[PDB]
Write a protein that binds this ligand. Structure first.
Ligand SMILES: C[S@@+](CC[C@H](N)C(=O)[O-])C[C@H]1O[C@@H](n2cnc3c(N)ncnc32)[C@H](O)[C@@H]1O
Ligand SMILES: C[S@@+](CC[C@H](N)C(=O)[O-])C[C@H]1O[C@@H](n2cnc3c(N)ncnc32)[C@H](O)[C@@H]1O
Ligand SMILES: COc1cc2c(cc1O)[C@H](Cc1ccc(O)cc1)NCC2
Ligand SMILES: COc1cc2c(cc1O)[C@H](Cc1ccc(O)cc1)NCC2
Lengths: 349, 349
């Protein structure tokens, strides 16, 4: 239908045939510090490819500038950069989505998050999904012979790379969640299970300094975590024991586990909480239907990552989460959307 | 910047951090024959993930259908498939773009074209663009110590993969080009340089049976080329000599060469043509501005594949092609948009 629409469909089909190049181009530009260079130049700066290349460690800036101008035009057509023309020369500025890959005040961005999925330890795993669907099991396990968190405890390089990737995504999002979710008035001893390096707790204690915090984590994660104020790092296993407190918190944890792991975990929360304790679960809820939206696209990608790394896991619906709580001991359950495609799921005991 | 805009920007930024999973997923689904399976069922058919897995060699259809429903939800988010909910069951149908990856009457689709970009010899090349922007040169040459087309004369597996990739793409578009471009009246002897396996000449000769056709091409390409009536496969080199004809044809050839190579090539064309000869160059022109369109994303994807495989090449504007015509001796130049993001540039002698 329609010649305009039929041409758009042909081009999208061609776009899909070579969509492997977009991650490769995005990573190369980002890791050439191009977004840092445009950003440092000042608020709303517009820099030519020749200007940007002046700051590269290159012995042939002529070739680099002609090469770079091609991939910067690519990022413009994918809405990552803006373009302005001054005498037939193209001047590029940061578009909204690029600011998530510019280092902020502390030097944090989504860069180590994107670079984790492009790691040499993970790249061959994405492309064994056909074998995984047909033969069951896990792509990550097919490639490495050990499951995901188990493998991390054997490779410090990838453990560290994963940890910075979680750390970076957490810092970027918790500022918007903390501003959305006003539910720490009745928190005094917060316990975060599978909290990574510790930044989620630290940022809650920074806005709510009455809170003391415990970070329950596997020991290979907490090995050299920073010594945040009011944060105690505890090395154990949330399927064995959870330290005692009045509130338990879980971000990007519940989605990694099957129903039987999830119930053993919520019963350990129940036993660690007091008669009025509560559990907080920060996660995306499973959408009832996929759709053509970047939220839906973000969610599906996460689903695909989960399939590849921890097949056991799943994104769950409201009804799936409520029933898991009730069987574990909890009485009340609430769902509060807290921005960034994320909910806070409250299991009141 | 509304809160909806700020939310869409975050979700896009998250989509970009994991954009490597989309090629992996589109490939795994295409190679499980899912687009064939839904297509067999009839125009507009909506199948459940369990119906689809009925035709897999899986040995565990239940795990297969769980896993497959996650990746099919992904393709619905990226507008490759449709999803309809019936009695709480998700039924998937083919969206217009997926039709390009369903084998047609002759068994051709963009499947081997996409699969070429995911080849084990091309994959390490895409993710070296930072190293090649800094040091100049070709990522392909850096990975495979020979330039692109010369390596093809050394790797019979990759030669076939590539030749089929070009065969598939030209079959798709050549029907629409011929339908839009009536500039083949008058032509008697058509010489096509870099014609590949020859399906594009064959197709022209099928609607214009009067035309005789020469397919000047590298020996390792025409070695096992098909035999089309009215098409003579000539092993050679367009930079040494182009056989005489009243019309010369180039598709996806010119963009692979720097300005000096194009002048030598156009000189050879000028000397092979009669007083009223003409050269036809089928190629995407360089757009003056990148835009947010699948057209411009397709164009940019190609510019980046160019950087990775043959750095010296370039897409060119009308003024740049005009200047190369004049320098080579041609009298008139014309530009006619055909279809499929392609132009015919006519060099008139
Ligand atoms: C994907 S991460 C989430 C990290 C952090 N919550 C965030 O959102 O950035 C899941 C974390 O849970 C931790 N984890 C997994 N199993 C665990 C267990 N049995 N006991 C303690 N921690 C565990 C992992 O080490 C990992 O860092
Ligand atoms: C990308 S392809 C285009 C194939 C075909 N025109 C199409 O569009 O499907 C470029 C072709 O030009 C051929 N080629 C490259 N250099 C050549 C030369 N010096 N003489 C003849 N053919 C050449 C290559 O073998 C390759 O098949
Ligand atoms: C979006 O990027 C990641 C997100 C997460 C992880 C890894 C990533 O690369 C790991 C494994 C996992 C991923 C997805 C899923 O559905 C379940 C578990 N844990 C939690 C979320
Ligand atoms: C879209 O996919 C391909 C298109 C083409 C080729 C390889 C691909 O993978 C080869 C190398 C090349 C690619 C791009 C470019 O700008 C110049 C040369 N020749 C012509 C067109």
């Amino acid at each position: 239908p329609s010649k305009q629409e039929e041409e758009e469909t042909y081009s999208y089909a061609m776009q899909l045939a070579s969509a492997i190049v977009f991650p490769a181009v995005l990573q190369a530009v980002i890791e050439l510090d191009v977004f840092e260079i445009i950003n440092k130049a000042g608020p709303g700066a517009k820099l030519s490819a020749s200007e940007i290349v002046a700051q590269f460690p290159t012995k042939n800036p002529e070739a680099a500038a002609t090469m770079l101008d091609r991939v910067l035009r690519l990022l413009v057509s994918y809405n990552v950069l803006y373009c302005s023309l001054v005498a037939g020369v193209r001047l590029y500025s940061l578009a909204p989505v690029s600011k998530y890959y510019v280092r902020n005040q502390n030097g944090v961005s989504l860069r180590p998050f994107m670079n984790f999925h492009l790691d040499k330890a993970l790249m061959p795993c994405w492309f064994r999904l056909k074998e995984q669907i047909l033969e069951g099991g896990s792509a990550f396990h097919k490639v490495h012979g050990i499951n995901f968190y188990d493998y991390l405890g054997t490779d410090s390089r990838l453990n560290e790379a994963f940890n910075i990737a979680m750390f970076s995504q957490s810092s970027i999002v918790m500022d918007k969640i903390i501003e959305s979710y006003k539910g720490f008035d009745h928190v005094n001893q917060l316990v975060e299970v599978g909290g990574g390096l510790g930044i989620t707790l630290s940022m809650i204690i920074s806005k709510y300094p009455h809170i003391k915090g415990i970070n329950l984590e596997l020991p290979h994660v907490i090995q050299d975590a920073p010594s945040y104020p009011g944060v105690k790092h505890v090395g154990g296993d949330m399927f064995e024991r959870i330290p005692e407190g009045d509130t338990i918190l879980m971000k990007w944890v519940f989605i990694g586990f099957d129903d039987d792991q999830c119930l053993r975990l919520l019963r350990n929360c129940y036993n660690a909480l007091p008669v009025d304790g509560k559990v907080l679960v920060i996660d995306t809820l499973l959408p009832e239907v996929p759709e053509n939206s970047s939220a839906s696209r973000e969610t599906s990608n996460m689903e695909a990552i989960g399939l590849t790394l921890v097949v056991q896991g799943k994104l769950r619906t409201k009804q799936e989460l409520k029933a898991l709580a009730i069987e574990a001991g909890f009485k009340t359950i609430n769902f509060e959307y807290c921005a960034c495609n994320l909910y806070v799921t409250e299991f009141y005991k």
